[PDB]
Every structure is written in structure tokens, then in C-alpha cells.
Design a protein around this ligand. Sequence first.
Ligand SMILES: O=c1c(C2=Nc3ccccc3S(=O)(=O)N2)c(O)c2cc(F)ccc2n1CCC1CC1
Length: 557
Amino acid sequence: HMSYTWTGALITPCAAEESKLPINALSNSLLRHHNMVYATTSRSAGLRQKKVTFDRLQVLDDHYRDVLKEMKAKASTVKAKLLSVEEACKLTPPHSAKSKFGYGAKDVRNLSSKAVNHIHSVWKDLLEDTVTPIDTTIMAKNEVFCVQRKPARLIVFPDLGVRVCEKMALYDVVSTLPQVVMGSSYGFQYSPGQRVEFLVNTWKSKKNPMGFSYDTRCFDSTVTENDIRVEESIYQCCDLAPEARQAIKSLTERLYIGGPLTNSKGQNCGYRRCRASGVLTTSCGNTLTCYLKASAACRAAKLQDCTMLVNGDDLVVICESAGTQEDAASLRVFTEAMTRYSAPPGDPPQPEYDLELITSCSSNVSVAHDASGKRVYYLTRDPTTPLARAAWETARHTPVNSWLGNIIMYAPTLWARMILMTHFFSILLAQEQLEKALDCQIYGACYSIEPLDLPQIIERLHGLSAFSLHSYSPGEINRVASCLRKLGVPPLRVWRHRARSVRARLLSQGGRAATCGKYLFNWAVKTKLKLTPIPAASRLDLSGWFVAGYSGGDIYH
Ligand SMILES: O=c1c(C2=Nc3ccccc3S(=O)(=O)N2)c(O)c2cc(F)ccc2n1CCC1CC1
């Protein structure tokens, strides 16, 4: 029951790929250890293929079926609607990969006759045929990391026409069903601050809290045909139009369960029998399957008063401690059960008795103080990957601006405020591009955002306290400082000096620019200004933000 079979044809690129960090006049102001930063390319795709190709065995017991029955009971309450062709078209990113059949994303977005006629033909084919495997493209992702090299991850996706049809059939389902089935355990319904609140309140709900993260090794490749059919059975519990039931069956049989892999040159590379990383249901499917396996494993291990938090393949569990020795024993049983369910561990899970020591969604809770001196919890992460990616983006325009996503999601953090805000506002100022909209990605969806709207966006997501936090923990400060030394980034004292300059330059611009100076860089002046609620912030349409995850799902706004 192999995750993949291969022909020996290579996974090929679409254009020249760079692995070495490009350097321009701005690079050394941010990062001097250029050799630490690299991008993955198709040259490492063979190594990735070896890692993700293996046999999956699955033994399913009564705990698994009991949890599944409960999930299906909750799913039965969901009513989901078909999207119109127009609605689905307007969800397509402007720079989404063009179709092989003679039209592109902008043709889709404009509702061109050619595009709309083809989408109708694809839809009719889904209704009429529930058996023929749907072709997919396989490509090596180009992502940036700091050394200590990862092989490229693989992306697998069907044609643009099919992607639009997935939205028509499943957008409402994948946006609504997860929170109904999993309630407060569904992670993608939370902003960063909401996630912190849930984690803190859950920790406090236990007499003697214990928590752990669980890392499944190569999750997508552990997902079996069984798993994908079980997912479909959950979708079909919803109140759906008959037409939608048929399209969902067809997509499951023809696309989600598996299909042929074609490289960028049109050659057959092999066949997939595990999760595709580039379909609409990747996020919802991984979340449901992870929750199902983990909930059943909790029961196997007799964990007391378990509360889970699930975002795709990323899992956190907080429960009542039965003692340190008993806790470690329970985790072994948990892992054994997950392994039987085809979710074997990467790193073995570790019990933690301090909430700040748990990492999940690459992040941890930490504590700072607000302007009144109150202790406030907030979400942070190790800044190594953010800074490596920011270095790349200093010298190259990319389709997704990680620095922008990171400023939005980690606005309250020491590193996002002192380094990312300072560095990028200085660059944009110099080019007068503050008002130019940029694409970023949050929970898998693409947003087009004007940097000048950051103050209002931050206030809405994090509150005004994001502009006032200070007295960060020694642990957090020490981690940031050591990261800077590692990458050869100037120390925080240099960044404070630069932020005073950037703040003054923004204030001299007037308007929204001055608001950025005032709010984003109040921390850099000795005599702070008041900072009152921004009237524009109460006006922003942040509907669609933090409802669901759509990683690989080709979703825009
Ligand atoms: O977890 C993320 C995700 C995210 N997490 C995921 C976790 C598991 C599966 C799929 C995703 S995903 O591809 O949908 N995206 C982001 O897209 C993200 C983007 C930012 F710009 C900054 C931080 C981000 N974080 C950490 C923030 C923490 C509240 C959860």
C-alpha cells in the first residue's frame, strides 16, 4: 500500500531556480551570514521522493470508529451550499497557474466565455464520470530556510478548471464543517490572540495541566485511501444538494484518493495514493483526519480530560496530569495508537508542564507587559526562518511576501516590531511603495494588502496593546538575540536607532504614512504618545479572516 510509485522521469522546473541568497545594496543592512540562507529547488526532489515513499499499514479499532460516529453525528447538522461559477471564479488568485486548455486566472476572474465554458464542461464531466483519474502536476517548491539542507517539498495540483470546480462543490463545506465537528478544537477559527486565549484558558481549566505537541512524520504521505474515503463520508453527512453529493463523490474517487503525476514537461512521473498537497480539501481533510486519529489515541492512552487544538497536521493536546511517570507512560501508548492508525511520529512527543515550552504551529506562548505594567500573554516564534525569508525578499520580488504575513500575525513580538517593521518600512519609504498592495498568505489563503493599512489591521487582530508591549521575557529576548548572532543580523540596539529614523521619515510623509510612524514605532521614542483607536480600524472588512484553513487550496481574499 505504497504512498507513491515512480517511473524514473524527473521532477522538472518551470524556470531557472536560484538556491543561493541573492544580494543587493540592501542585504547587508539586514543579514551578513549569507551562506546560511538557501532556497530549495528541484535538484533535491529525488531525496524528497525517497523520504515520502513508503508502505502504509492501518489497524482500526473501536476507539477509532466510536470517535468517527461522533464526528459524523455533528457533521449531520451542517447545511452547505453550492457556489455559483461566478463566486468560485472570484475566489481565484490573480496569479494562479493557468489552464492547459487555453485560458488563465485573469480570464477566470473576468468571467471570460472561454474560461466559463471550460469550467462548465469540467463540472459536467465530474457529474457524468466518477471513475477516471484526474491528471495532476507535480513540482518542487522553492522555499527559503536557514541551514541546520532540507530537500524541496513537493506540490501536487490539478488543472485550473478543476480547481474552480472544487470551490463550487466544497468551499462552503470546508469553510463550515470543521468548526461544527471539532468546536473549539478547530485551530483555524482563531486569530493569534484568540489562539493564545484558548491555550491559556484550557491550561487553567486543568487542576494539574500537562501538554504536548505531536509531530507526524510526513503527514500527507501517511494519509491512506481509507482516510480519504472516511473524509468523504463525513462531507456526505452534510445537508447537500444531490448535484453537490455527486461532485464530491467524483472528486474523491478521481482526484483526492490518488492519480497520475505529470512533470512540467508533460512526462509521467508516477502515481500518488496519498494526500495531494494542492487541492481545496487538503487543510480540512488533514485537520479532520488528525483530529480523528488523535481523539481515538487519547482514548487508547486513557488521557484524563483531554483538550485538543488541531490545525491540519499540527496537533496540541492539553490534559490532566496523572503524575509525571504516568504521563510519560500515557504518551508512549498515545504514540503507539497513532502509529497503528498510520500517523507515526517524527520526533517523539514530550510531556510539558510549562505552557510556554510547548511549540505548535511553529509558535509558542510567551509573556510581556502592557503600558499599565500588566502581564499579557501573546504568540511568538523562533525568528530564524522569518529573517532568512526577509533576507531573500530584500533582494528579490516573490509571489508571497512572508515579511508582511509575519508582521500581521506576529505584530506583538519583539522581533517583528524592531526588525521586520523597521527594515521593510525603510525599504518601501525609499521607493514610495507604501500604498502599493502586496500579496501575503495567512492560513493558506492569499490576501492583497496595502502596507499603509497595517496599523488598522494590527489593531483589529491584536488590539492596541500590540503597539505598547514591553519588558519581554529573558527567554524570548535571549532567543531573539542568539538568532541575530547566528544570522549576522545587527543587534537590537541598532534596530532601535534605525526605527527612530524610519519613524521620523514616515511622520514627514503625512497621512496614513504618519499613522504608521506614530503607531508602529511608538516603542522607539522615549516619550510615548497616547495611541487611541484608529477610526479606519472599525471600518475594515476582515470578514473571511480566521474562519478556516485553505493551505494548497488556491483561495484569494
Ligand atoms: O500557523 C500559521 C499559519 C498556518 N499554519 C498551518 C498549520 C498547519 C497546517 C497548515 C497551515 S497554513 O498553511 O494554513 N498556515 C500561517 O499561514 C502563518 C502565516 C504567517 F504569516 C504568520 C504565522 C502563521 N502561522 C503561525 C501563527 C499561529 C496562530 C497559528
